């Protein structure tokens, strides 16, 4: 029952601009290059509009082939700032974000409706996290995985929706499972 992983996207091993598409273009999701604890650059996406009303900030990947996989796995590493560490008494601060996908045969889609995106889940910090010493503090780099299928189009677009969190997406790894090959 051991399956190999076929990696479709590994954002953390992209060097230079990820070039994902943010809606709005400014004042929502921003690409931010940071150094990890080993001084290795990571392209992150961040937003923290917690002094505003509830948000609707979208970020999407370009098209990802599914290579005729029935099911795809999406692993997100992320860090967030706790709402109880931020000002305001409007009750709008969240510690979650929303994950979506849009299956398409078209590898050059633009200006897509919100209602073409299918919600995968609300993503929250849970038990799975790496502890990273950031000076005197222990940062939780949270790891969450979800899967989708049965897939039926040539590929898909992933999207991330911020509704009012202080959130940084650090890694997006997308893969499917494949039986090991026979070594002729």
């Amino acid at each position: 029952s051991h399956m190999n992983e076929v990696t479709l996207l590994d954002s953390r091993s992209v060097q230079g601009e990820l070039g994902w598409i943010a809606s709005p273009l400014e004042g929502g999701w921003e690409e931010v290059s940071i150094m990890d604890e080993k001084n290795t650059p990571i392209r992150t996406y961040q937003v923290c509009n917690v002094m505003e009303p509830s948000q609707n900030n979208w970020l999407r990947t370009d098209w990802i082939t599914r290579e005729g996989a029935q099911r795809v796995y999406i692993e997100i590493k992320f860090t967030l700032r706790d709402c109880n560490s931020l000002p305001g008494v409007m009750g709008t601060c969240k510690e979650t974000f929303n994950l979506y996908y849009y299956e398409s045969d078209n590898d050059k889609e633009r200006f897509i409706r919100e209602n073409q995106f299918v919600k995968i889940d609300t993503i929250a910090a849970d038990e799975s996290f790496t502890q990273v010493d950031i000076g005197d503090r222990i940062m939780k780099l949270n790891t969450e995985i979800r899967d989708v299928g049965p897939l039926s189009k040539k590929g898909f677009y992933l999207a991330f929706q911020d509704v009012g969190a202080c959130i940084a997406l650090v890694s997006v790894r997308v893969f499917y499972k494949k039986a090991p090959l026979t070594v002729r």
Binding site: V32, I34, M35, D36, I42, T44, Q46, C48, T79, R81, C166, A168
Partner: peptide
């Protein structure tokens, strides 16, 4: 906001 996250500086690495």
């Amino acid at each position: 906001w996250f500086r690495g």
